[PDB]
Specification:
It is classed as ribosome. Keywords: 60S Ribosome, nucleophosmin, ribosome biogenesis, fkbp, ribosome. The entry is titled "Fkbp39 associated 60S nascent ribosome State 2". The structure is cut from a larger assembly and holds 1 copy of chain A, 3 copies of chain B, 1 copy of chain D, 1 copy of chain E, 1 copy of chain G and 1 copy of chain H. Chain B is mainly alpha-helical. Chain B contains 2 helices and no strands. Chain G is elongated. Chain H is mainly alpha-helical. A two-stranded antiparallel sheet of chain H has the order 1-2. The chains are: A alpha/beta, B mainly alpha, D alpha+beta, E alpha+beta, G alpha/beta, H mainly alpha. Chains C and F meet through strand 1, strand 2 and helix 1 of C and helix 1 and strand 1 of F. Chain E binds 4 RNA strands through helix 1, helix 2, strand 1, strand 4 and strand 5.
Chain lengths: 133, 52, 48, 123, 125, 52, 94, 180
RNA sequence: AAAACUUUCAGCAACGGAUCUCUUGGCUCUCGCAUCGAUGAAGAACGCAGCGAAAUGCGAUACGUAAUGUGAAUUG
RNA sequence: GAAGCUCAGACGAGUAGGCAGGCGUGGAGGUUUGUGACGAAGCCUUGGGCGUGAGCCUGGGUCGAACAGCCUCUAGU
RNA sequence: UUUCAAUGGCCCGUCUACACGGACCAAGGAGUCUAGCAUCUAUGCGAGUGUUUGGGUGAUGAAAACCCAUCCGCGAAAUGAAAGUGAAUGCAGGUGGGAACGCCCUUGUGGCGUGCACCAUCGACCGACCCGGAAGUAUGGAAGGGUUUGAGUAAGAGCAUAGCUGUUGGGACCCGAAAGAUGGUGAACCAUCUAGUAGCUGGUUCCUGCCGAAGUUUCCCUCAGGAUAGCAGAAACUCAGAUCAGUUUUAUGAGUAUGUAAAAUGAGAGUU
RNA sequence: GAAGCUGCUUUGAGUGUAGACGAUCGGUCUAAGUUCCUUGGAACAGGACGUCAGAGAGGGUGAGAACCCCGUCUUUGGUCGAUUGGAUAUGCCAUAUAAAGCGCUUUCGAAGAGUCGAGUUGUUUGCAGCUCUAAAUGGGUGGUAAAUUUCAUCUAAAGCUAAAUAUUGGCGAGAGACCGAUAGCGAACAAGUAGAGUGAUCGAAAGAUGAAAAGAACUUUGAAAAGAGAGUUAAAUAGUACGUGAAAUUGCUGAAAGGGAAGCAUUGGAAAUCAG
């Protein structure tokens, strides 16, 4: 692949931004996002607030203030009622998921915000949605 | 404001309609690229159009 | 959020101003609008 | 919203000031200098630029400002040059020295062709 | 713009009703304007033409000529005026048709029925 | 040609509202108005509001 | 659209719905959850699954420790004990 | 053969003009008659409450209006239906009662009040019945305490064995009559 | 090693009625309405105009009479 | 015209078949202050030009009323 | 542009040298619409999703647009023939590995890790199957034992719309067979069903570029066929490798060749 | 429900007048340039200067007309008829010695037969032929049981009834991302016409002068058809074999080639003709 199949202008801006980041820095994180932003919709499965919470507070934790990054959708999981303070960056958050993060927790970011924050992707966990569907 | 609501509060004249939220926070990509948070980390820019 | 100035019948700027509605902050998606316009303009076609 | 999304809407495919041909595209827009469609010289998509255009024996200039760019009536202001082709050149480069210089080489060249009109029109 | 559901903007129907009209309606279609003086005299804009009406030709090659309608030729949508004639090739004379829209009434054939028609159109007799 | 060709086409109601909002927001960008062909070279303000 | 089709390129080329315990606390109005979950109140919330079109309450998931009464037609054989140590009660709808 | 739906906007507009013409014909009285509160008859829907055909003869007898007066003043009567649970008696009763309370009957023969029909007549107004008489759903309970006696009530003690008791009741009853 | 003849090219003229433009037509959709006859229907035949052969109109009162309306034609 | 500019290297038959980009036609929405009785469309042409090609622009003649470029939609293409 | 000279040039299409079609020109003329299903891509929303059966509104243009109502469909739970029961072991696991990142030792490398998707394994968790019957009101079920079972749970991912492609059915890419029925006319014919059976014959309309086989395999078959490969591909993901080879060599056993193993040699090599 | 008992409630199968309300027809009323210059046969074109707009839908007029015309908008209206819609008020008769509804019963309750049903044959449980043929808590129908039973629900063999619904016909309306004369109905015109078959039936071809017939006077040649001059036209390169007029195909003129073919391609020469 060399370009995204969508015609979304806002997605093409992300591709434009991250082409520069991948080819002007050596960060393999930027290359990873570029390869995953080119992917089709069914190759970019959703992720859940429950999964992200489990993946941060997992075993030895080691999450702290590391901002979780996923290229896809961050859906909510109503099966959990206690949501920890989280910092998440993604293409899009469902309306319920965004409210649950904001009202009791940390912050939501878009991918362009992440670049202005951690352009090398320093101290981030690059999760991926379940491809089993 | 009553018709279209907002991206955070439900529209008064459209039940459970929240304005869609942008995929990207800022659409001024050139200022992002030329920002100090990015230009300070980028490796030495390679040459533009070159001689044969 | 900025504000806009209302204008009068005579064409002068009125005293009052209104806050800019949140709708003007929505994304501008030419491709989605074209796809919807393609599929909405078909809804007043009489069969032949 | 922002300038890139404006360019991604109007610049690439549809504008009233754009002219496509067999494989080439030109910008008729009265505020562009090179006359051709790109992000660096787009009138509608970009912030303040400078151009010049003819009127009945003289030349006059268009500019923008960032604060007032939401009010199209005086978004552009007009300044007039009707004294000499050379003095126009010194005027034009002066009013763009404190401004980005990526346009002068197109701007200053545009002038002399417009002034060349008046000479050829006189002939 | 029409808003009544009872009239046609269709070219097909409008042309058929025009070219396929009776004589009692063709008379209405042959309405001609009044000249300024009688227009201000009667407060009327136009009337259907009648035989022996005194008119003036405004448009066409016969412009400026006056006369009286010797006969309104309703079927052909033409008006006929004396001394407005064409020299036949053999030597005869055959008048010409000037459409009712291109003439102007300079002197009516006033009559009782025409009096009520003028006063019925809010006019002054 | 049969009359029962598929003449009308469904669109998701939310997508319809999305596009209407986007066209409304697009009506407030003077660049978009000029490109579409409107003559707003001397309009006082986009958006333009007159009194009640 | 015919113009994109392949023909325009071949020219020449010839009754019991189920609810589990991880979902009862999602059936409340959000203000009921706000003011009744986790607070040591004398009176406990009541959940009528039948009003959400659910017949049998199965027992999959963990529970918050807030006491809550569940009204249901049928119930799985573990779903009741889990709400015992959850402090709430189960009583059966007729 | 092939049933097409190109008249769907047309048929919708026909009904609107049908309602508007009907309502304007009988403007004083409400366009829509009242209906009782009735429960759908099956285990899937029995919890819900919907509008039935008419009020049973028990309810008109209780409400104090004859089956003749009710038909004249816009109360439909259903003879087939019979109401057995006295709540269905109730819920329909005040439904008739409040309808009569808000009902205003114009006197016949030049506005001399007969019996208790009414005195005022300028209050003529055509109102939606579902506004003054909406049909509600079942009243659910909220925040009831204790019932720790139901705590010890360990569900299947009833369900599992009484279901088996019901299943084996016929065989059990046959057994008892056999050795007797 | 001409002319005639054949062939090719161009000009002009024939032949033919394509192309373009149009349109009182068709087709489709929707809406509205319910009205034949033994008190002689639908259909058919013969007649009726100043000169009509055509189409409609009409029935020995025969391209109609009575009445109402319009207001001054009809037309080759 | 980031869908852009630039440098370098190798390669080039092709049936069924797979893929991509284009040319042309009728009608629809938008746009070009678009062309036109001082001659639209069409038609002819030992006139000229463009494209690898589908095709396109133009000169002259005839003609007499409508027609086209661009971005999309559509199909009795 | 015409013509001349030299040089070359079998008449095109279709089937399999033929044969079959072609006197010439203009116009018409053949993969269409719809329903189901499936993949893929895109858009909206997301444990939800879909209001166009219906109601409101829109009279100035009104078959549109907009608003409201989720009964219901699909999804959220599986198993069993059915009664009926009905799914985090273990930071909703470990076991190894595994993405980027951090994380350095402050270079990086390497590691430290972390572990996403995952990946394989497994611990298990529910149903069925079998053995056992704590209890609790004949009834009845638990604890526990299987290495039998399920495109099972194990922190849901689907729903709607549009497009492309394939397939099934409707006349079904177009054209073409005798026939048969119904009802009529005349002493065989007519009109409808009919646009039939078509396993075939013929035809099937613009350009350029790119990739490009197969005839024999893999078996299976009642039949023609499919398979299946192979080839050509299309999408996802390992290792910078002994990871390969229509190849040679060396050693090695057995009676130049044989195989296995390894030196030469060229290439980024695998996959589901 | 009938028949006895009770006290409340009620009441027309009527008839003129006035006003309002709507339905339709019938008619009537509807704003503003035809002002100048250029082209043109014609201005409805271009330019200048204005006007109306609840009217800038559409059509006509000698070429793209909001203002020349018909119309369109106001119009869900003003007016004028005619009837009718039934309500409102009013006036007059009516007869009204009245009957009915509901508290109660001290009870009586009639209820559809060759029908239901069973067996049998046909056909798509339903119906039909055939033989038998019922009953009064009976009969039909089902959940149960059990193969019988309880239980539930309904009252067949008599009958009426608007609305939501259908509508390739008829008549009347409005439209179209439709067809544009080999298309669209077979039929845009003299179309179910001419015509064909004994008959049932079958069934075409055919649109376009011009703004106005101004449809070509007159002279001459010819018997005539026609020709040549003329004459009309903005135009006969519009003459009724009529807009535009393509190809196949034919004739004349000019050029060139050719000894049993030609056509085509590459390279140039010659002749013609362009181009920068």
């Amino acid at each position: 692949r060399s370009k995204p199949a969508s015609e979304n202008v806002y997605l093409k801006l992300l591709v434009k931004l991250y082409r520069f980041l991948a080819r002007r820095t050596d960060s393999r994180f930027n290359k990873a996002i570029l390869k995953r932003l080119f992917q089709s919709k069914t190759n970019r499965p959703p992720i859940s607030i429950s999964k992200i919470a489990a993946l941060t507070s997992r075993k030895s934790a080691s999450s702290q203030n590391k901002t979780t990054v996923v290229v896809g959708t961050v859906t909510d999981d109503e099966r959990m009622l206690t949501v920890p303070k989280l910092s998440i960056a993604a293409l899009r958050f469902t309306k319920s998921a965004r409210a649950r993060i904001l009202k009791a927790g940390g912050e939501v970011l878009t991918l362009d915000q992440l670049a202005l924050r951690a352009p090398t992707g320093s101290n981030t966990v690059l999760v991926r949605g379940k491809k089993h569907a | 404001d009553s018709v279209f609501g907002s991206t955070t509060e439900v529209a008064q004249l459209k039940k459970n309609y929240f304005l869609p939220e942008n995929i990207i926070s800022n659409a001024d990509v050139t200022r992002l690229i030329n920002s100090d948070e990015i230009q300070s980390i980028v490796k030495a820019a390679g040459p533009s159009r070159v001689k044969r | 959020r900025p504000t806009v100035s209302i204008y009068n019948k005579d064409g002068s700027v009125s005293s009052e101003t209104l806050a800019l509605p949140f709708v003007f902050k929505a994304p501008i998606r030419p491709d989605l609008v074209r796809s919807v316009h393609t599929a909405v303009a078909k809804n007043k076609r009489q069969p032949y | 919203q922002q300038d890139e999304v404006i360019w991604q809407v109007v610049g690439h495919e549809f504008c009233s000031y754009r002219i496509k041909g067999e494989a080439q595209n030109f910008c008729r827009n009265e505020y562009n200098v090179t006359g051709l469609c790109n992000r660096q010289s787009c009138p509608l998509a970009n912030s303040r630029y400078a151009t010049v255009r003819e009127d009945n024996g003289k030349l006059y200039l268009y500019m923008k400002t960032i604060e007032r760019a939401h009010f199209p009536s005086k978004l552009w202001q007009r300044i007039k040059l009707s004294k000499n082709y050379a003095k126009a050149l010194e005027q034009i480069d002066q009013q763009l020295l404190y401004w980005p210089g990526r346009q002068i080489h197109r701007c200053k060249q545009r002038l002399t062709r417009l002034t060349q009109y008046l000479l050829k029109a006189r002939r | 713009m029409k808003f009544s559901r009872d009239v046609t903007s269709s070219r097909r129907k409008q042309r058929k009703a025009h070219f396929g009209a009776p004589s009692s309606v063709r008379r209405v279609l042959m309405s001609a304007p009044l000249s300024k003086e009688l227009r201000e005299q009667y407060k009327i804009r136009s009337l259907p033409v009648r035989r022996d009406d005194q008119i003036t030709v405004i448009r066409g090659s016969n412009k400026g000529r006056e006369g009286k309608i010797t006969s309104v030729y309703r079927k052909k949508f033409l008006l006929l005026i004396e001394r407005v004639t064409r020299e036949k090739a053999n030597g005869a004379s055959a008048p010409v048709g000037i459409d009712a829209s291109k003439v102007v009434i300079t002197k009516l054939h006033l009559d009782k029925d025409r009096k009520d028609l003028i006063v019925r159109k809010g006019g002054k007799v | 040609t049969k009359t029962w060709r598929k003449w009308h086409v469904k669109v998701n109601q939310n997508e319809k509202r999305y596009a209407i909002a986007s066209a409304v927001a697009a009506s407030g960008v003077p660049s978009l108005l000029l490109a579409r062909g409107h003559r707003i070279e001397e309009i006082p303000e986009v958006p333009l509001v007159v009194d009640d | 659209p015919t113009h994109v089709s392949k023909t325009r390129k071949l020219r020449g080329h010839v009754w019991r719905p189920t609810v589990n315990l991880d979902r009862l606390w999602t059936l409340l109005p959000n203000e009921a959850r706000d003011k009744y979950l986790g607070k040591n109140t004398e009176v406990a919330p009541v959940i009528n699954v039948l009003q959400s079109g659910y017949g049998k309450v199965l027992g999959k998931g963990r529970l918050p420790e807030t006491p809550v009464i569940v009204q249901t037609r049928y119930v799985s054989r573990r779903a009741e004990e889990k709400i015992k140590q959850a402090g709430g009660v189960v009583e059966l709808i007729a | 053969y092939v049933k097409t739906w190109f008249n769907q906007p047309g048929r919708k507009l026909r009904r609107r003009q049908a309602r508007q013409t009907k309502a304007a014909k009988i403007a004083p009285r409400p366009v829509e008659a009242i209906r009782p509160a009735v429960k759908p008859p099956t285990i899937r829907y029995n919890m819900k409450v919907r509008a039935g055909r008419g009020f049973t003869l028990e309810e008109l007898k209780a409400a104090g209006v004859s089956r003749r007066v009710a038909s004249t003043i816009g109360i439909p009567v259903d003879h087939r239906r019979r109401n057995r649970s006295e709540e269905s008696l109730q819920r329909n009763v005040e439904r008739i009662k409040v309808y009569l309370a808000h009902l205003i009957v114009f006197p016949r023969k030049a506005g001399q009040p007969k019996k208790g029909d009414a005195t005022d007549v300028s209050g003529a107004e055509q109102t939606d019945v579902a506004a003054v008489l909406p049909i509600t759903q079942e009243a659910v309970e909220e925040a009831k305490p204790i019932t720790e006696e139901a705590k010890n009530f360990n569900a299947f003690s009833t369900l599992s064995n009484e279901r088996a008791y019901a299943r084996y009741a016929g065989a059990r009853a046959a057994f008892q009559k056999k050795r007797a």
